[PDB]
């Protein structure tokens, strides 16, 4: 109170806007392969592990397969393909949002590779990048 | 074609891009009427003021902390 209020302070009206947990798109499910459309790893195929509280999807390359480390990715900048891997092998509880502010990636990668081996040619798929060739129309293209 | 529908909003009317309404000032006494309304108003020295008076007005305005719209006019050009 060391200064009397010069002019006046207009208090903001109370806001009836409570934040609620996000409702993700139906295609996104744990163990779903993803295509990243921007950033350092744009056009690179990655695996989906879990959805964080702050609405940043968590993804692993695996770094072993394609050199993409554990990372947070925005959901809207990602395409979801119809091919899946079982994520039950990897537990994915410890690492969280605040944690993001090598050994863990190795632990995750061993379990995820274990499931990757069963499906044919999946490692090659995750290794290679994606791009649009001439004559490719996305709207028909089933991803 | 001019017409009333083009009229500007009252809350934004008569406002410079700096956000200060321009008020004409002739002498120090008229400057002092804008002592606290520094946020709402900015002073503008009249065209007919002599150079000797303009420096005094500018000094008093700086002391009061009132924005002058046209300083360095007739003390500098443009």
């Amino acid at each position: 109170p060391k200064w009397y209020p010069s002019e006046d302070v207009a208090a903001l009206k109370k806001t009836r806007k409570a934040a609620r947990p996000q409702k993700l798109r139906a295609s996104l499910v744990p163990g779903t392969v993803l295509i990243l459309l921007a950033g350092r790893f744009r056009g690179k195929r990655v695996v989906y592990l879990k959805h964080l509280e702050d609405n940043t999807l968590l993804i692993s390359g695996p770094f072993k397969v394609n050199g993409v480390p554990l990372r947070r990715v925005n959901a809207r900048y990602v395409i979801a393909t119809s091919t899946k891997v079982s994520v039950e092998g990897v537990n994915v509880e410890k690492f969280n949002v605040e944690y993001f502010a090598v050994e863990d990636q190795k632990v995750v990668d061993k379990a995820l590779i274990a499931e990757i081996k069963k499906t044919p040619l999946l490692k090659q798929y995750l290794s290679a990048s994606f791009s649009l060739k001439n004559g490719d129309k996305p709207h028909m293209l089933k991803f | 074609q001019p017409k009333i529908g083009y009229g500007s909003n009252k809350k934004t009317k008569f406002l410079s891009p700096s956000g200060h309404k321009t008020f004409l000032v002739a002498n120090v006494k008229d400057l002092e009427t804008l002592t606290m309304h520094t946020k709402t108003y900015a002073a503008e020295i009249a065209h007919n003021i002599s150079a000797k008076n303009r420096v005094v007005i500018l000094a008093r305005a700086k002391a009061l902390g009132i924005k002058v719209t046209n300083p360095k006019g007739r003390l500098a050009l443009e």
Partner: protein
Amino acid sequence: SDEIVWQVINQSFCSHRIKAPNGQNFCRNEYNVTGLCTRQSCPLANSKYATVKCDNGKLYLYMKTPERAHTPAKLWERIKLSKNYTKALQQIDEHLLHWSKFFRHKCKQRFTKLTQVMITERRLALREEE
């Protein structure tokens, strides 16, 4: 007669009034706290009134009451606000006890601004002395 005086001053020549480009009016009256010609503003319009006004280094408080409406020479009682800002606000509130909130709020704001102006004119005119 304050209402009559105000109505004449409003719909006739308030010589201290200046019509700004926006349409807002400013009374030039030195005693005026709020330099805007209104019902609550013209010291001429209102019998009960107060203002902070600077004389030399001091920031005096001027009081106006209907009792001294006659004898305008002695009308404005002069009170010295203490240099301590907190003490000054306390003295203003005390003297303006049971006094309409408009004049009290405006008086406090004017005291704050005049104190800042005194500080900053001390700033602009700092000299080698002391």
